[PDB]
Amino acid sequence: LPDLKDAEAVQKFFLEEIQLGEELLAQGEYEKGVDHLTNAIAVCGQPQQLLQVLQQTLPPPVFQMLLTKLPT
Amino acid sequence: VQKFFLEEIQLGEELLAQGEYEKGVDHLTNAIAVCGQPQQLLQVLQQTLPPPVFQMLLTK
Amino acid sequence: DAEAVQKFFLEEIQLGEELLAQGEYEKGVDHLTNAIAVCGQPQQLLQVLQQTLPPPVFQMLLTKLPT
Amino acid sequence: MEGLAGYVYKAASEGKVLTLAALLLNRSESDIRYLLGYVSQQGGQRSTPLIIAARNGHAKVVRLLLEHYRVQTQQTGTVRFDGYVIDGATALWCAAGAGHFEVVKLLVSHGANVNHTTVTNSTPLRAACFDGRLDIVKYLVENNANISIANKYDNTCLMIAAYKGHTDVVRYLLEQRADPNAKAHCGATALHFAAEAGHIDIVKELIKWRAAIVVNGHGMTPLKVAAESCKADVVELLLSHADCDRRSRIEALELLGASFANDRENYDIIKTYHYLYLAMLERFQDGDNILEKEVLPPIHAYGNRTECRNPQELESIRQDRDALHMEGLIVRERILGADNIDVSHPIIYRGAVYADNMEFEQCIKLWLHALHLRQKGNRNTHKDLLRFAQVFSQMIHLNETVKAPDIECVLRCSVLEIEQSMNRVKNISDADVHNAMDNYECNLYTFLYLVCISTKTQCSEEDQCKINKQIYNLIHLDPRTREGFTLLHLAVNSNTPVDDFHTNDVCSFPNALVTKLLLDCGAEVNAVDNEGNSALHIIVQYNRPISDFLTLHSIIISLVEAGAHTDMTNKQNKTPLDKSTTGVSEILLKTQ
Amino acid sequence: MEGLAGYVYKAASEGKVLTLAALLLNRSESDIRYLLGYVSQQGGQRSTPLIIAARNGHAKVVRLLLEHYRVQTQQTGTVRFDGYVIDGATALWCAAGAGHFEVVKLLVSHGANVNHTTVTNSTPLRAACFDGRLDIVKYLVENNANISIANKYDNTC
Amino acid sequence: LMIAAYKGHTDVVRYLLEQRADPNAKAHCGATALHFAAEAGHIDIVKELIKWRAAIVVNGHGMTPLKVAAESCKADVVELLLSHADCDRRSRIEALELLGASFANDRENYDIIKTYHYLYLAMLERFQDGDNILEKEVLPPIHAYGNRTECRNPQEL
């Protein structure tokens, strides 16, 4: 994680962390995709609004799988 | 069988009502006479098809 | 160039499928129009192209195949 | 003849014309006459097999049936389809009611009733107008059907055609010497119905006929009934007719924008701000002898700010949609009154957004006005009261506490609504008596849901004393269900349904806390149901003594203290111990 | 602003969702709509992120654009890229011409324009006929758009 | 069978018992296809096997499925095992004892009042019959647990 930067990695390095997950969403390694996704949400500036966003970007097995690893 | 003839007079031309009139009009040709009222069934079967196909069903 | 095309043909083979996967069906075929008819086995590519692409996509590539 | 009647029906329902020929012929004529006359249980209706074939448009099939034995075309039978369950009219109406021109053009030449009525006096022209099928509508007027067939709700077929967007069916009746001035039972015209959905093309045809334009029986001019909608083209169209006075034409755009953002299907603040600002620009355009809004103080329920005055004042409150939605809703609050249903509709939508936006404090406060508005309108709030308890359960999961005055106001108005709901059963006799039987009963459930979540949530002592009054109100009312249960028996029985939302997590029926609150206010503990079982008998019939024994242990001691007869009997003479089927409850019953 | 509009237009054109979701993040509806209102010409043809999302085929992107975002079906875009590139395109029209039945039914359930006429007054019905996608035509007819909307040459669907 | 019983896949559980697979295929660890169902309160799964003659038998440690259901603080399926096959009143009273034991001594379920009322139910049923009275075995007081001598009367409880 990029040490929770104030304004640098909130939008620049944040984008690639989903992009690694989004590729791994397209790859099929969703567990690796969740890992890159769950670091982005932790370093996201306003991630509580993205709970409704992230609950439907996924296949149904990953709907709860990311949620279980969301605090992690 | 007379009941099977009635079944023939009811389901023999199932393809004819479904569009495939080749196997239905030919099958209903014997089924019209096999019923208890041959002249009535043949006239009704001719009336069941179009007037252009009424002659085709009757002459079948 | 034609020997480099044999690797450049593989580029639209790689890059052009996302263009069809993203949704640019015409542009993906247009990107793949520059690719096809330079490989050594167009028929071997054709027999899988009948089913690799979606059935509407492949026949549209057939229109672009001699172009 | 049961199977033979169905086989005759099957000959016409599925379209097999060969079976129909083999059935009417090749047998007797008297037996088939009963078979083709009507059906008994086929399709859940009692119509002629030719009629149900006309429902599917089997024009070729129904033609052969008339050749052998001419069934009466005027014969009627039930047709349950669109427009509620209907004891349907003649087959020509039913073919028109099916929107099938293939059967309509045959029965008319064969001989059929052109203006045959239905239960709601529906002519075949209205049946085709209900489907909006133009060629059938063109044919009935060619058969000279009556153009003035008004419904039991005084709805003429032209007004029926004006319900939908049938810009061609509406204009064709206008060509057939029918001016659009036949008001409904609520006074509604074709102008108002086309203005409901913003049918500018339909109104333009009614504009073209140049007949008349007037308010409905609710006093709503066609621009006003479009103003509460989200389509400004109608008000723009009436601006060409110069029927839009500058007072009405400005509040129209004030109402037009607000509904375009205060709707579940219509939420866009950009035109809402544009319509409100342009109207207030036009409101300030008068200059001398200026006209302004009748100022309304902010509602104790809805919001905390009054409406805006300056045209640019609403521009600053555009950033927070909460302020401008309220500002657009005050201007329709004053012009439509508290009794209008269409101004009560934005109240539910606003808190629902706040439920989606986690503003549960603003959701409960603002939703109280919808119950407040519907109390003025004297209508049912069974969906409103259920939505209160659902959102009340949702914020417990988010741990957002309620306001005790807010939870009392909804509870105080609920028993008044239930008193209306109980009187609604008294007010109606035969129209929707089963619906009214299910109307007051579900309202008691919502009150039970509202009280149960009130017990779970924190409540102030002064409000809790008033909260128990509504329970004390209903236990004095003593609502008797279909099975003889009461409010006490409703909480006692574990078979009581609970709403699908998080109210399952806050209702634990048999709920001791609700029952404990029910017992102090005078619960009928020895009351009997239709089967004669008392409150002690219903609670012991529960088959899960381990899961919620805390509810059982609280209710065993306390309900017995209320005066429960351990020796009481049912209508089948069943004692509480005899009808126990639970060792833990019976031993608890033995102790108590 | 304009570069962010290009970014969100490329994100909608590609099919990613979190990219433009973060690009619109922590923004009011004004600049968000402006980024979504990027109707500027790309490839010589006017296109819009909502339009290019409907042209893409991703029902997920348009289901986010209609539900969680404020965009309108009244828009300008291509209707036929090869030899026509005619403007005045509804997103439902773009989906029907492209043939994505899921996007078509989603836009219909949303409430998109079903009777739109361009400068050549061409309906999405005739686009669905041009694509030959049966279920799109069946859905459009069941939703009762029209049947007799013809081109400027009186060209029926 | 036990793997789906380990999870909440009640559709697979009720289907597989009809596939000529016995519910008594017991693992050497002690799971009798209901022990693995007695962790998450699978009221729907256990109801199937109770209907399917689950054949209650203790685990490798000697704990009954009634005890194992009481081990997970799942009162829903405890009544199912109590109502299935033999009543076995000696285990019926201790089922209330074991289930109530954890509700004041478990992190996931810390309910002090539920411990009394389950024990009171145990104390009620232990002396409900009157004659042929049963009593708790007098284990010596343990210094870790103070010096208490159990609850052989409802008055001390």
Curated annotation (Swiss-Prot), chain B:
Top-level taxon in the UniProt lineage: Eukaryota
Post-translational modification: Ubiquitinated by PRKN during mitophagy, leading to its degradation and enhancement of mitophagy. Deubiquitinated by USP30.
Subcellular location: Mitochondrion outer membrane
Site of covalent link Glycyl lysine isopeptide (Lys-Gly) (interchain with G-Cter in ubiquitin): 3
Physiological role: Central component of the receptor complex responsible for the recognition and translocation of cytosolically synthesized mitochondrial preproteins. Together with TOM22 functions as the transit peptide receptor at the surface of the mitochondrion outer membrane and facilitates the movement of preproteins into the TOM40 translocation pore. Required for the translocation across the mitochondrial outer membrane of cytochrome P450 monooxygenases.
Assembly behavior: Forms part of the preprotein translocase complex of the outer mitochondrial membrane (TOM complex) which consists of at least 7 different proteins (TOMM5, TOMM6, TOMM7, TOMM20, TOMM22, TOMM40 and TOMM70). Interacts with TOM22. Interacts with APEX1. Interacts with TBC1D21. Upon mitochondrial depolarization, interacts with PINK1; the interaction is required for PINK1-TOM-TIM23 supercomplex formation which is critical for PINK1 stabilization at the outer mitochondrial membrane, kinase activation and downstream mitophagy.
Family as reported in the entry's similarity comment: Belongs to the Tom20 family.
UniProt name for this protein: Mitochondrial import receptor subunit TOM20 homolog
This protein's encoding gene: TOMM20
Range within the parent protein: 66 to 125 of 145
Swiss-Prot record, chain C:
Localization of this protein: Mitochondrion outer membrane
Post-translational modification: Ubiquitinated by PRKN during mitophagy, leading to its degradation and enhancement of mitophagy. Deubiquitinated by USP30.
Effect after changing residue 7 to R: Defects in mitophagy
Position(s), cross-link Glycyl lysine isopeptide (Lys-Gly) (interchain with G-Cter in ubiquitin): 7
Assembly, per entry: Forms part of the preprotein translocase complex of the outer mitochondrial membrane (TOM complex) which consists of at least 7 different proteins (TOMM5, TOMM6, TOMM7, TOMM20, TOMM22, TOMM40 and TOMM70). Interacts with TOM22. Interacts with APEX1. Interacts with TBC1D21. Upon mitochondrial depolarization, interacts with PINK1; the interaction is required for PINK1-TOM-TIM23 supercomplex formation which is critical for PINK1 stabilization at the outer mitochondrial membrane, kinase activation and downstream mitophagy.
Physiological role: Central component of the receptor complex responsible for the recognition and translocation of cytosolically synthesized mitochondrial preproteins. Together with TOM22 functions as the transit peptide receptor at the surface of the mitochondrion outer membrane and facilitates the movement of preproteins into the TOM40 translocation pore. Required for the translocation across the mitochondrial outer membrane of cytochrome P450 monooxygenases.
Family the entry assigns: Belongs to the Tom20 family.
Entry protein name: Mitochondrial import receptor subunit TOM20 homolog
Taxonomic source organism: Homo sapiens
Gene giving rise to this polypeptide: TOMM20
From Swiss-Prot, chain E:
Subcellular location: Cytoplasm; Nucleus
Tissues where this protein is expressed: Widely expressed. Highly expressed in testis. Weakly expressed in other tissues.
Sequence ranges of the ANK repeats: 45-74, 87-116, 120-149
This protein's GO CC annotations: Cul2-RING ubiquitin ligase complex; cytoplasm; cytosol; mitochondrion; nucleoplasm; nucleus; ubiquitin ligase complex
Disulfide bonds: none
Effect on the protein of changing residue 130 to A: Abolished binding to -Gly-Leu-Asp-Arg C-degron at the C-terminus
UniProt KW keywords: ANK repeat, Apoptosis, Cytoplasm, Metal-binding, Nucleus, Repeat, TPR repeat, Ubl conjugation pathway, Zinc
GO molecular function, one term: metal ion binding
Family: Belongs to the fem-1 family.
Protein name listed in UniProt: Protein fem-1 homolog B
Protein species of origin: Homo sapiens
Gene label: FEM1B
Full protein stretch here: 1 to 157 of 627
Curated annotation (Swiss-Prot), chain F:
Residues noted as binding Zn(2+) 2 in the record, renumbered to the chain: 29, 61
Ranges annotated as spanning the membrane: none
Binding site for Zn(2+) 1: 28
Mapped ANK repeat ranges: 1-25, 29-58, 61-91
Distribution of this protein across tissues and organs: Widely expressed. Highly expressed in testis. Weakly expressed in other tissues.
Effect upon mutating residue 6 to A: Strongly reduced binding to -Gly-Leu-Asp-Arg C-degron at the C-terminus
Record annotation: effect of changing residue 36 to A: Strongly reduced binding to -Gly-Leu-Asp-Arg C-degron at the C-terminus
Subcellular localization(s) per the UniProt record: Cytoplasm; Nucleus
Residues reported to bind Zn(2+): 29
Protein function: Substrate-recognition component of a Cul2-RING (CRL2) E3 ubiquitin-protein ligase complex of the DesCEND (destruction via C-end degrons) pathway, which recognizes a C-degron located at the extreme C terminus of target proteins, leading to their ubiquitination and degradation. The C-degron recognized by the DesCEND pathway is usually a motif of less than ten residues and can be present in full-length proteins, truncated proteins or proteolytically cleaved forms.
Subunit structure: Component of a CRL2 E3 ubiquitin-protein ligase complex, also named ECS (Elongin BC-CUL2/5-SOCS-box protein) complex, composed of CUL2, Elongin BC (ELOB and ELOC), RBX1 and substrate-specific adapter FEM1B. Homooligomer. Interacts with PPM1F and PHTF1. Interacts with the death domain of FAS/TNFRSF6 and TNFRSF1A. Interacts with CHEK1. Interacts with NKX3-1.
Similarity section: Belongs to the fem-1 family.
Name of the molecule in the record: Protein fem-1 homolog B
Encoding gene, per UniProt annotation: FEM1B
Residues included from the entire protein: 158 to 314 of 627
